[PDB]
From a paper:
It is characterized as a porin that forms non­specific β-barrel channels allowing free diffusion of hydrophilic molecules across the OM.
Here, we present the first crystal structure of the V. cholerae OmpU trimer, at a resolution of 2.2 Å. Loop L3 deviates from the wall of the barrel and extends into the barrel to serve as a constriction loop in the pore lumen. As in all other bacterial porins, the β-barrel surrounds an aqueous pore through which cargoes are diffused. OmpU possesses a unique N-terminal coil consisting of Gly32–Ser42 that extends into the pore at the periplasmic side and forms a second gate with the constriction loop L3. Although L4 of OmpU is shorter than L4 of OmpK36, L4 of OmpU protrudes further into the extracellular space and projects over L1 of the adjacent protomer to the proximity of L8. The graph shows that the minimum radius in native OmpU is ∼3.1 Å, which is slightly smaller than the value of 3.2 Å found in OmpU with a deleted N-terminus.
Residue numbers in the entry:
A (entry chain B), B (entry chain A), C (entry chain C): 32 to 351
């Protein structure tokens, strides 16, 4: 719930004797304004979740989600835009859950500490693929008392090469190889009983990229505060450092949040944002919002386009 | 309903006190014959409608529709043909309904006066984008007594330009601009009590394009008559003028219709069609039909291909 | 059931008085290992089946199925991969069922004699388009006692040619023609009473391609054996010949299969496979499996890549 931009659970269309199917997703209208110029960023999601009990401590699972968009640019055009965001199957029970296929890595729940806005935020906490969301990957999650644990491992992708090792078509190949894109990620979160305090940390590595994250949060009644720190290498000796702060509170159905994000890549500031929004929940599956991002990049460095502020206006319906 | 080619409403997959989800669409097999040569024009549609009541005079809505086709050309090929026809969210109530995202403009309900065939017709009533269906657009509709009103406004699309004003990548851009494709549309329909007589009119404008339409219809017992006139400019001094006539009758099940369509572009005849069909309704969601279009373009002007007649045969199943 | 890799029936989401809609499909995680190198071959399917009774011996039908995949190659990429596998509508009753749109030809049920593995097999029984699955085709099937009959006919696809006879765009064309890809297929299967013996055979022809198939099987309690032979022409005078053997055994919740596959194209061996697998059914709609294919091609001929063994590991959830 606090991660406002994230998916909500869908609803049952059939069920019987331990086995069910839920359909979910959203229709979200989004208008973006930059320098008084408008862009349509609306999006639809559809998803399907199947779950089958094997016994009282064992079950199977299957999941798909797709995203659909348009880009007319002034004509009634044909729009062939599709993104298969999740494709996996898995097994779970007392020991937790394990899946294969495109699914989330371990660091998402860490970045969730400060990723609480409806449209903006989450600009200074980059995640590498194995830590984020990618296929050819085994993914695990589990909960033991007040400790939550996630982990993932990704295989390098098979390819085909000629005698010298250049990537080529499979018909013209001398042998199989791989792209060296194997990797792993790991994260842990401890909840201190009640009192509202959470702490979390994580690490990830893939090819010549690596990173770690530290985070903490306090939640009390209608108030919330959190902080997050990210540090690693994107390649070479290229350093990345990110800071995020977030605060939010609720008044009736209205939720209000603000974040500060600051990122540094190769010893220059690549992101510097203060953003604010307001979201009104008419119903659990119907909401409206408005958001503004103050861009603090220079404009002598960087440039005019990349230093522009942004206004966003949204209307979101959820299927469930 | 009289507009036979249009969508029918889908059916509920879950509900729970003012909130529902409906799934709909069609599987429509269509064979096209020209000069004794056959083409498969079959199509599938799937759509999802969510609706949530906020109160006795207020609700929210979200909608998506996609269309799916194949084009094998003699091989068992992979077919990645998708069209996202609708993507919008909106709010409605006592005063009517307003939406944002790709949805219909105002002139469709006007062209519906003569658009009554299962396959042919609707060839001499061109609609510009704001009047037809397009994104980055606010759309409104309402009904008050015997008066129906529709309206829409579309924003110009943001783009990025270099110092010289050339459209370029955002990374290579000196500033933001737009494509000048803003516009609007408006239409009204009046019903003369219970007399079966209807009149309608509309207007639309976008960049160097504009148009207006006038229409009238009469319905009595098992008979229907209608006329439609379209006039405007597609650009420069490129004039467009369109005339359509339609008549139909019903006998038990199976419906019979005929239309005449005639269009003139740049002071030359660009469309000239007389068409007849028969459609048999086995069930409300299962029908068959057959249609023939007499092409009356010359062949000395125009050409042999563009002056050919067409036979069409269809079988349509609707999901509900 | 015996054709393990094939679809299972979906489940009802709504129904009323003879008319229903079923949603089905799968989420299937699949890991492929060749030369110690891993490839993600996971896939999702979604399908929608509508059926409406007209009377005690007459009904209508509409069907769609799509397949969805990812190919990240180490990045969190956008994946626009869709395949519309089926798009058809049809009518059926006492005499059987007839459809138009992309659907199956007649020879699939013949290749089903030995196509019983979860992942491998079915490598030496090539089917031409009209016999396989393709659009612009009328398809018929029926069952009368122990006789199953299937047939199909496909039209050539309309195209457009210039004065010189070259395929060109419709605006630049002198006339309509076609690609000469018309054809037909035919097949039959008899069950020899309650003896466990089945015999089947089929034939197909399209443009300059043709083929026939012969098959037989014996099924008794928890044992199964079958054989299949394929012979025809792929073009001009270039020959194709295929041989398949299959065996299977069942123990409680557990299936075990093995197949031998051998094909010859243009008087050279193009396929040579011995494969074995094991599949465990936790629930009717949740299973796991592991499979190994011994590749028997030479390696001096053909090459190293095309002669590699393969290990496969799978986890399959079915939507119903
Ligand atoms: C995200 C804003 C920070 C407020 C955190 C306080 C703890 C409650 O957060 C739950 C997520 O809020 C969902 C908003 O839904 C509004 C429903 O109001 C019910 C409680 O007033
Ligand atoms: C439907 C094409 C126009 C034919 C004239 C119809 C005007 C007469 O009023 C009948 C109105 O019903 C229109 C519905 O048509 C759909 C077919 O439904 C037949 C099932 O009974
Ligand atoms: C499927 C190939 C395995 C060879 C043994 C089958 C011979 C006996 O047939 C018995 C009927 O079962 C056929 C369907 O099996 C599908 C999986 O069912 C497992 C759930 O009980
Ligand atoms: C999977 C290895 C488990 C290591 C976790 C050790 C438990 C105490 C540390 C968890 C709390 C998070 N933090 C930030 C304090 O490290
Ligand atoms: C006391 C200042 C609180 C700053 C954080 C508030 C979050 C942003 C709220 C959006 C603007 C609405 N407002 C002004 C009522 O807070
Ligand atoms: C709590 C937010 C902390 C953000 C402060 C981090 C400052 C980054 C310093 C980099 C300055 C850029 N440079 C290269 C000119 O030094
Ligand atoms: C929690 C502190 C956040 C403060 C937000 C202040 C926004 C700064 C905008 C600058 C414009 C103000 N002014 C007066 C210069 O126009
Ligand atoms: C009174 C007949 C004059 C035509 C009426 C207009 C409807 C034409 C429908 C075409 C159907 C062909 N049919 C069966 C009527 O001959
Ligand atoms: C029932 C409506 C009939 C509309 C037909 C209009 C005919 C105009 C086309 C004539 C040829 C154009 N022009 C002006 C060059 O002669
Ligand atoms: C009430 C009759 C309307 C239903 C029309 C159904 C037509 C079936 C198609 C038959 C094809 C005949 N044809 C075109 C080959 O001559
Ligand atoms: C043209 C030959 C007629 C078809 C042969 C009929 C098959 C024999 C009938 C066996 C009946 C079996 N069963 C289970 C379907 O009832
Ligand atoms: C023909 C299928 C395999 C069993 C062979 C039995 C021979 C009977 C052939 C006559 C029936 C032909 N058929 C089924 C197309 O009607
Ligand atoms: C008792 C015979 C059972 C044969 C089936 C064995 C399947 C191999 C195990 C694959 C499952 C891998 N994993 C971890 C995803 O479950």
């Amino acid at each position: 719930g606090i991660n406002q931009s994230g998916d909500k659970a869908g609803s049952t269309v059939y069920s019987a004797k331990g086995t069910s199917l839920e359909v979910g997703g959203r229709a979200e209208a989004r208008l973006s304004l930059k320098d008084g110029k408008a862009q349509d960023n609306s999006r639809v999601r559809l998803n399907f979740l199947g779950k089958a009990e094997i016994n009282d401590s064992l079950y199977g699972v299957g999941f798909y989600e797709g995203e659909f968009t348009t880009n007319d640019q002034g004509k009634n055009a044909s729009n062939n835009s599709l993104d298969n965001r999740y494709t996996y199957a898995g097994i779970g029970g007392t020991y937790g859950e394990v899946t294969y296929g495109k699914n989330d890595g371990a660091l998402g729940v860490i970045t969730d500490f400060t990723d609480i806005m409806s449209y903006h935020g989450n600009t200074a906490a980059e995640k590498i693929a194995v830590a984020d969301r990618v296929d050819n990957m085994l993914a695990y999650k589990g909960q033991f008392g007040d400790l939550g644990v996630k982990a993932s491992y990704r295989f390098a992708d098979r390819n085909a090469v000629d005698a010298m090792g250049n990537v080529v078509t499979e018909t013209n190949a001398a042998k199989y190889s791989d792209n060296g894109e194997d990797g792993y990620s790991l994260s842990a979160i401890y909840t201190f009983g009640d009192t509202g305090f959470n702490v979390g940390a994580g690490y990830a590595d893939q090819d010549d990229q690596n990173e770690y994250m530290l985070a903490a949060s306090y939640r009390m009644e209608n108030l919330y505060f959190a902080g997050l720190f990210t540090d690693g290498e994107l390649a070479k000796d290229v350093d990345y450092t990110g800071y995020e702060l977030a605060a939010g509170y609720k008044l009736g159905q209205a939720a209000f949040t603000a974040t500060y994000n600051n990122a540094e890549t190769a010893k220059e500031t690549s992101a510097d944002n203060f953003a604010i929004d307001a979201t009104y929940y008419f119903k659990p599956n119907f909401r409206s919002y408005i958001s503004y991002q103050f861009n603090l990049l220079d404009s002598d460095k960087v440039g005019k386009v990349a230093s522009e502020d942004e206004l966003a206006i949204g209307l979101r319906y959820d299927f469930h």
